[PDB]
């Protein structure tokens, strides 16, 4: 008996087509992935002809160009009550060693024909569409795995993939214990013989989430969901002698560490995903790692943290934007705060006036007084972050003072050094000015950043942060400095490659631990795409406006349950 | 047939004993390690009573204090011509479940008794010493593995482990390099059946090198050597299967590049690579395999990655790297020179620390449009910024007391009073001072951290890392700085974290580095602070308040 799997791409609302075509621009990587999955004999996965089978509906077959159909190097089966096997044979001259397309009257007919006639010849069976066969395959229960290309943008659609148990991996289920009726979806039988019995209910669990890809302005990733029971109870290698000699020394060296692992319940972000390729697993694993292995300490605010020292993460910028999906990020704040920085502004009331209240609780007359700055007007963060970037070291009077040409303009120097001499190893910008710390409302958190260019005009950025609030700050800081890297790269004719986050005191507050364990049950969605708008207008880092971006296809999980 | 292994601890001169006792103070982890290894049955390592045998010569039996004798929970066999099984039994009669201590006329005798009379009970046979039994074991050829605790210091000894093919893992090999070995080294048969034939020659090769431990002021590490022939020298099935064709095409690119690159790898035979120097060795390899070649300011040609890290433990041993000697002197004097606020490179050079000299020469300062710098004047660089951040620089003779931000004083004061602060930083990266400086700083920031156990940790961030030449020194500098700060804050040093920006090797050093990568690392030395009672503030340290105990690095590269 032969494996059956579903291969599909769908928008977050399960859209799969419109007017008998695909709803989106051509996803190149997806087409390559589709071919590599459907053409791969199972022997070659881990490094007398045997081939795979793709089964499609009539319309799906009719949606293809004659030159592409039948799909090369795979036995094509078409479920149609009207298509004739001989018409299809007559469409084009038959290639050598290509199978003869078959036409069957139902999915059960096709699977049967493959099992009996093609027993020695076919290895794997793929259902490649459309919604008819998808529903057929899901209700029949035959699909062990679903290869789902998650397309992060919505498009107009007339054809949708059936709702199914496991489809919350696509977007937020408003049935967060607040359902109207039980969420409607095909019944997936776990044991296909045993039909729609109450005990025989299956769900699809993700085992595999890739990093985000993109083509033609469409971000997407690949997941593999595996049929499990809907149990809902929660509701290197070496020689055998080389390994056995080492083992007693690895055994006692790990005694102190094995003991503490069984004394506590190791946290783990969505443990069932074996291949954790989505880049957000760095963030989720860091959260787990601080709860698991950090040390509970006291801190400035009184709340109390668990902390690690010296942690890192890297995010790709060549295909999507690392705007974290397991809890929505205040994008408007990231953008207005960063444009503010670039301006050299220290007046937080310019932010507070735009809805970005993040600096407010630190520019109060009370707090400015707690810092022995009774001379500071409310909203005057002092000579802080963006002051230090555009005027390092300059004397500070107040936020209304114009500071043009005072101090060192590191951002101008980084951009100039990248335009002219990108192999330089001194392209730094710091806000950590210790002669200025006491003039500041807040000593800067993200305090250093460095730029690099490889042999292919690809720009990377490191940023060092002494204090990282993983629960609330880190995702903002990741977006803040990723966005900076997009902006710098654009005004420098570089392509953006990677943001690297270097972290000092890295902590979670003990009042967030319970909510963060909740977050760690969330599987990340594909990353969005951040597009610079009006690129031809924007020639210098100061030309960017808050209206010059667009966060396309951002599909984050919602609010925490606590 | 039952596996035979050797367990031993030895100084780099192969010394194992003096006056029929151990040559060193008590090594607790070695004791822990020896007991876990000789007592672990393979049931509990790969995760009717079954026990291993330890086999020892007569004097090793007599060297054990009677409280430890016989070794508990293991069959004890003593190879002796005088000792009698009777007498041994009458010395401390055996507990229930312990084994009668056996006595045998020879290691062949002992090993037959184990294979014939303990064929159902004995799992592993360990030969535990001393010199007489070790030599027999090596020459018989029965030992598949050697478990050697490499004690990093030499202590006086009157008994030594036999010279053996593979003893290069202990120290350098010049004074008796290769032609002294046939007369000194035991011949180790590969197949013990075929004995001492020309094509039956074996060697012992490192498969396992642990991180460096210490006790009672003795640094040491654990290795396992395997017998090899001398002639090699000059999730669920459905889950995994479902996933695999997807990994197959995502790995398409990186497999095809991999199969073209012939991959540098440090000492690839070592499978467990616990020694912390492997991060450095690996990093060098990662850069040569995967970095990008461009040229640089001088046109020399550099291979670079961007954003690398390493971490080193300061609690048992000091990361003075062993695959190439580190200029400890320069590390210690430059760091004190930093702590002084001193910017006069001549004060180092007159101490034989010549590292700054090429960057303070009249010609070089002129290349920085600093024709007004007196020769030796690094400008308001590293130490000036640590102790006078933002101060206005005159020259290296000026007394800047009370000017600028004394970052180092604030760090210590914060560690002594509010150690859970998260602003305890110190930077030399002053962009307003950069042009006043001979060299824009390399290690430009460092941050400190205390856990709940009085343990200090330091992160240093470095924009530009010459992995070949600069980096091991930089590791030493900031690790030693963490020892000094820890001591004057009544803290214990835990860890030095190295955050690297542009990280590179020059293309001319690549051939020499392939050679260096052929060397197994040695155990780290201990660095000690003497006169701790006399040292109360970070300025009180002097060059004489330090000692480096146990540093046995490889010698110079031929390439
Ligand atoms: N994004 C993706 O991954 C994919 C997208 N698509 C898109 O989806 C749409 C096509 O899906 P759809 O519109 O549902 O048409 P289908 O591809 O499902 O083919 C529909 C026809 O196939 C036959 N058929 C389908 N289901 C059954 C069944 N259960 N039993 C018997 N015969 C069956 C019938 O042919 P007859 O009436 O002749 O009996 C039916 O009218 C197109 O827009 C296409 O582009 C298609 C495939 C994959
Ligand atoms: N650092 C370490 O790991 C270890 C260190 N040591 C140190 O080593 C020293 C003891 O070793 P050593 O001094 O060599 O004495 P041994 O422990 O080697 O035993 C020597 C005696 O054992 C018997 N013997 C040894 N080899 C043979 C043989 N091939 N055939 C038959 N009988 C044999 C003889 O006993 P008889 O004369 O009765 O026949 C010989 O006199 C001590 O200083 C001890 O502390 C010991 C063990 C391990
Ligand atoms: N992840 C994924 N799953 C899928 N089921 C398809 C798919 C979509 C429409 C028709 C068919 Cl047969 C397959 C794709 C899109 C890539 O399909 C490549 C094979 C089909 O090739 C063509 C070529 C032209 C028009 C329609 C399909 N990606
Ligand atoms: N890596 C290693 N290898 C070894 N062969 C020994 C060893 C040394 C002397 C005698 C014996 Cl039987 C074993 C040790 C030292 C720890 O051995 C613990 C067992 C013997 O316990 C004592 C205690 C005090 C003096 C002598 C042996 N470490
Ligand atoms: O950009 C920022 C700014 C602040 N924080 C968090 C980290 C700490 O929880 C707190 C900073 O306070 P101190 O590090 O000064 O104690 O705010 C961030 O994560 N990112
Ligand atoms: O403390 C130091 C000082 C210098 N370098 C090396 C790294 C670079 O190869 C070179 C510095 O040159 P630039 O970073 O200025 O280009 O010296 C170090 O590794 N550590």
The verdict on B186 and B305 lying in the same domain is no
Q: Closest partner residue to A36 among B242, B245, B451, by Cβ? A: B245
The verdict on B218 and B285 lying in the same domain is no
* Experimental method, per PDB record: X-ray
Q: How far is A40 from chain B (nearest CA, A)?
A: 7
Give the integer Cα–Cα distance in Å for A138 and A482.
40
Work out the angle between the directed axes of helices B471-488 and B278-290 (0-180°, nearest 10).
140
- Cα distances from A11 to residues A6, A150, A154, A223, in angstroms, run 16, 6, 5, 13
Task: Name the domain count of chain A.
Answer: 2
The verdict on B171 and B318 lying in the same domain is no
Ligand 2 atom nearest to B83, measured from its CA: 38
Three-state DSSP class for residue A29: helix
Ligand 3 atom nearest to A68, measured from its CA: 23
Q: Judging by beta carbons within 10 Å of its beta carbon (0-12, 13-18, 19+), is residue A105 exposed, middle or buried?
A: exposed
Q: Closest partner residue to B429 among A296, A423, A428, by Cβ? A: A428
The verdict on B175 and B301 lying in the same domain is no
The verdict on B542 and B444 lying in the same domain is yes
Give the integer Cα–Cα distance in Å for A169 and A240.
41
CATH classification of the domain holding A294: 3.30.572.10
For residue B524, report the distance from its CA to the centre of ligand 2, in Å: 30
The verdict on B217 and B285 lying in the same domain is no
Top mutation candidate among A129, A130, A146 for ligand 3, by most atoms within 8 Å of CB: A129
CB A249 within 8 A of CB B222: yes
Q: Residues near B6 by Cβ (< 8 Å), separated by ≥ 6?
A: B126, B127, B134, B137, B138, B143, B145, B146, B147, B148
Active-site residue A157, yes or no? no
Ligand 1 atom nearest to A10, measured from its CA: 1
Instruction: Name the residue among A142, A134, A102, A97 with its Cα closest to residue A118.
Output: A102
The residue ranges of DSSP E strands in A86-217, in sequence order, are 102-104, 122-129, 145-151, 159-160, 202-209, 213-215
CB contacts of B495 in chain A (<8 Å) are: 309-310
Work out the angle between the directed axes of helices A474-491 and A331-343 (0-180°, nearest 10).
50
Give the integer Cα–Cα distance in Å for B460 and B482.
11
Residue B303: how many CA atoms within 13 Å on its side-chain side? Answer: 18
And the tokens for B80? 């002796």
CB B45 within 8 A of CB A248: yes
Within-domain flag for B138: yes
Tell me the Ramachandran region of residue B289: left when phi exceeds 0, alpha when psi lies from -120 to 50, beta otherwise: alpha
For residue A31, report the distance from its CA to the centre of ligand 3, in Å: 7
Give the integer Cα–Cα distance in Å for A522 and A517.
9
Q: Closest partner residue to B241 among A42, A297, A464, by Cβ? A: A42
And the tokens for A251? 């055994």
For residue A196, report the distance from its CA to the centre of ligand 5, in Å: 54
Residue B95: how many CA atoms within 13 Å on its side-chain side? Answer: 9
Domain boundaries, position A145: 4-229
Q: Judging by beta carbons within 10 Å of its beta carbon (0-12, 13-18, 19+), is residue B550 exposed, middle or buried?
A: buried
State the residue for tokens 């006792």: B21
Q: Considering Cα of A335, then A341, then A344, then A347, what sign does the dihedral take?
A: positive
Residue of A28, A236, A303, A428 best to disrupt the B interface, most CBs of B under 10 A: A428
Instruction: Name the residue among A28, A55, A553 with its Cα closest to residue A331.
Output: A553
- Residues framing ligand 5 (Cβ under 6 A): A 300, 443, 445-446, 467-469, 473-474, 477; B 422-423
Rounded to the nearest 5°, which phi and psi values hold at B533?
Answer: -65, -35
Q: What is the DSSP string of B191-238?
A: STTT-S-GGGBEEEEEEEEPPPEEETTEEEEEEEEEEEEGGG----HH
Q: Considering Cα of A272, then A276, then A280, then A284, what sign does the dihedral take?
A: positive
The verdict on A346 and A430 lying in the same domain is yes
Give the integer Cα–Cα distance in Å for B427 and B440.
12
Within-domain flag for B386: yes
Q: Using CB atoms and an 8 Å cut-off, which of residues 321-380 of chain A contact chain B?
A: none
The verdict on A407 and A545 lying in the same domain is yes
Within-domain flag for A261: no
**Residue contact B207–A238, C-beta within 8 A:** yes
The verdict on B318 and B196 lying in the same domain is no
* Candidate list B5, B104, B157, B442, residue with the active-site label: B442
Ligand 4 atom nearest to B33, measured from its CA: 1
Nearest CA in chain A to B502: A425
Give the integer Cα–Cα distance in Å for B189 and A94.
67
The verdict on A308 and A388 lying in the same domain is yes
Within-domain flag for A259: no
Q: Using CB atoms and an 8 Å cut-off, which of residues 282-301 of chain B contact chain A?
A: 292-297
Within-domain flag for A242: no
Give the residue before each break in chain A, using a C-to-N cut-off of over 2.5 angstroms; say none if it is continuous: 47, 235
Cβ atoms within 10 Å, residue A216? 9
Q: What is the resolution of this structure in A?
A: 2.7
Residue B127 counted as an annotated binding residue: no
For residue B152, report the distance from its CA to the centre of ligand 6, in Å: 32
Q: Does B126 touch chain A (CB under 8 A)?
A: no
Q: Which residues in B65-79 are b (16+ Cβ under 10 Å) and which e?
A: eeeebbbebbbbbbb
And the tokens for B86? 């009777």
Q: What is the DSSP string of B292-328?
A: EEE--TTS--EEEEEEEEEEEE-SSS----SSS---H
Q: Are strands B15-17 and A428-430 parallel, antiparallel or unpaired?
A: unpaired
Residue B94 counted as an annotated binding residue: no
Three-state DSSP class for residue B493: strand
Within-domain flag for A311: yes
Kind plus residue range of the DSSP H or E element containing A224: strand A218-229
The verdict on A409 and A547 lying in the same domain is yes
Give the integer Cα–Cα distance in Å for B203 and B190.
8
Q: Does B32 touch chain A (CB under 8 A)?
A: yes
Within-domain flag for A559: no
Say yes or no: CB of residue B149 within 6 Å of ligand 4: yes
**Residue contact A246–B208, C-beta within 8 A:** yes
CATH classification of the domain holding A20: 3.40.430.10
Domain end residue (candidates: A229, A258, A293): A229
Instruction: Name the residue among B130, B139, B137, B131 with its Cα closest to residue B186.
Output: B139
Give the integer Cα–Cα distance in Å for A402 and B207.
66
Closest ligand to the CA of B17: 2
Three-state DSSP class for residue B25: coil
Cβ atoms within 10 Å, residue B20? 13
Instruction: Name the residue among B71, B70, B36 with its Cα closest to residue B222.
Output: B36
- Cα distances from B6 to residues B10, B37, B68, B192, in angstroms, run 12, 11, 20, 16
Give the integer Cα–Cα distance in Å for B9 and B130.
10
> What is the residue with the minimal CA distance to atom 13 of ligand 3?
A128
Residue B82 counted as an annotated binding residue: yes
Domain end residue (candidates: B229, B254, B288): B229
Instruction: Name the residue among A5, A6, A55, A15 with its Cα closest to residue A161.
Output: A15
DSSP B117: I
CB B297 within 8 A of CB B504: no
Q: Which residues pair with A550 in a beta bridge?
A: A531
Domain end residue (candidates: B210, B229, B248): B229
Instruction: Name the residue among B313, B264, B269, B29 with its Cα closest to residue B169.
Output: B269
And the tokens for A490? 């654009």
Q: What is the DSSP string of B370-398?
A: -TTSPTTB--S-HHHHHHHBTPPP--TT-
Within-domain flag for A529: yes
Q: Are strands B302-313 and B492-506 parallel, antiparallel or unpaired?
A: antiparallel
Three-state DSSP class for residue B261: coil
Give the integer Cα–Cα distance in Å for A149 and A145.
13
Nearest CA in chain A to B35: A252
Give the integer Cα–Cα distance in Å for A345 and A364.
17
The verdict on B197 and B309 lying in the same domain is no
Give the integer Cα–Cα distance in Å for A417 and A430.
16
Tell me the Ramachandran region of residue B307: left when phi exceeds 0, alpha when psi lies from -120 to 50, beta otherwise: left
């Amino acid at each position: 008996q032969k494996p059956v799997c579903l291969v599909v791409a769908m928008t977050p609302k399960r859209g799969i087509g419109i007017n008998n075509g695909l709803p989106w621009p051509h996803l190149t990587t997806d087409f390559k992935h589709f071919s590599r999955v459907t053409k791969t004999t199972p022997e070659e996965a881990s490094r007398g002809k045997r081939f795979n089978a793709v089964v499609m509906g009539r319309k799906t077959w009719e949606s293809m160009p004659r030159k592409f159909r039948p799909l090369v190097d795979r036995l094509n089966i078409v479920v149609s009550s009207s298509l004739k096997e001989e018409d299809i044979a007559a469409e084009k001259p038959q290639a050598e060693g290509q199978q003869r397309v078959r036409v069957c009257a139902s999915l059960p007919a096709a699977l049967s024909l493959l099992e009996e006639e093609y027993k020695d010849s076919v290895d794997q069976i793929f259902v490649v569409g459309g919604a008819g066969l998808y529903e057929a395959a899901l209700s029949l229960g035959v699909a062990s795995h679903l290869y789902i290309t998650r397309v992060a943008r919505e498009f107009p659609c007339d054809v949708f993939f059936p709702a199914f148990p496991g489809d919350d991996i696509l977007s937020n289920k408003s049935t967060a214990a607040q359902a109207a009726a039980p969420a409607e979806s095909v019944f997936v039988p776990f044991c296909p013989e045993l039909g729609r019995e109450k005990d025989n209910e299956a769900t699809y669990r993700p085992i595999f989430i890739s990093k985000t890809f993109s083509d033609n302005g469409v971000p997407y990733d690949f997941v593999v969901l595996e049929k499990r029971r809907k149990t809902d109870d929660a509701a290197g290698l070496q020689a055998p002698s080389s390994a056995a000699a080492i083992a007693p020394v690895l055994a006692w060296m790990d005694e102190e560490d094995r003991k503490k692992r069984e004394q506590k319940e190791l946290i783990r972000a969505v443990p069932h995903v074996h291949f954790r390729g989505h880049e957000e697993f760095q963030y989720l694993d860091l959260i787990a790692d601080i709860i698991n292995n950090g040390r509970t300490m006291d801190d400035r605010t009184g709340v109390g943290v668990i902390s690690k020292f010296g942690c890192t993460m890297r995010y790709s910028l060549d295909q999507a934007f690392p705007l974290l999906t397991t809890k929505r990020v205040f994008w408007k704040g990231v953008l207005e705060e960063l444009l503010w920085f670039i301006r050299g502004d220290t007046n937080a009331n310019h932010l507070s006036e735009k809805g970005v209240k993040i600096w407010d609780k630190n520019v109060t007359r009370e707090f400015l007084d707690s810092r022995n700055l009774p001379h500071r007007e409310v909203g005057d963060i002092g000579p802080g972050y963006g002051f230090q970037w555009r005027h390092f070291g300059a004397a500070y009077k107040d936020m209304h003072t114009d500071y043009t040409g005072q101090g060192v303009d590191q951002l101008k120097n980084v951009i100039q050094m990248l335009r002219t001499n990108p192999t330089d190893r001194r392209m730094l910008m710091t806000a950590w000015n210790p002669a200025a710390l006491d003039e500041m409302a807040l000593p800067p958190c993200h305090l250093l950043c460095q730029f690099y260019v490889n042999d292919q005009k690809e720009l990377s950025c490191i940023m060092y942060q002494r204090s990282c609030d993983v629960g609330l700050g880190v995702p903002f800081n990741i977006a803040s400095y990723s966005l900076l890297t997009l902006m710098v790269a654009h005004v420098c004719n570089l392509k953006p490659k990677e943001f690297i986050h270097f972290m000092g005191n890295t902590h979670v507050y003990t009042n967030h631990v319970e909510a963060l364990k909740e977050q760690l049950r969330r599987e990340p969605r594909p990353f969005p795409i951040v597009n610079i708008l009006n690129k031809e207008r924007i020639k210098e880092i100061d030309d960017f406006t808050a209206e010059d971006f667009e966060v396309v296809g951002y599909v984050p999980h919602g609010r925490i349950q606590m």
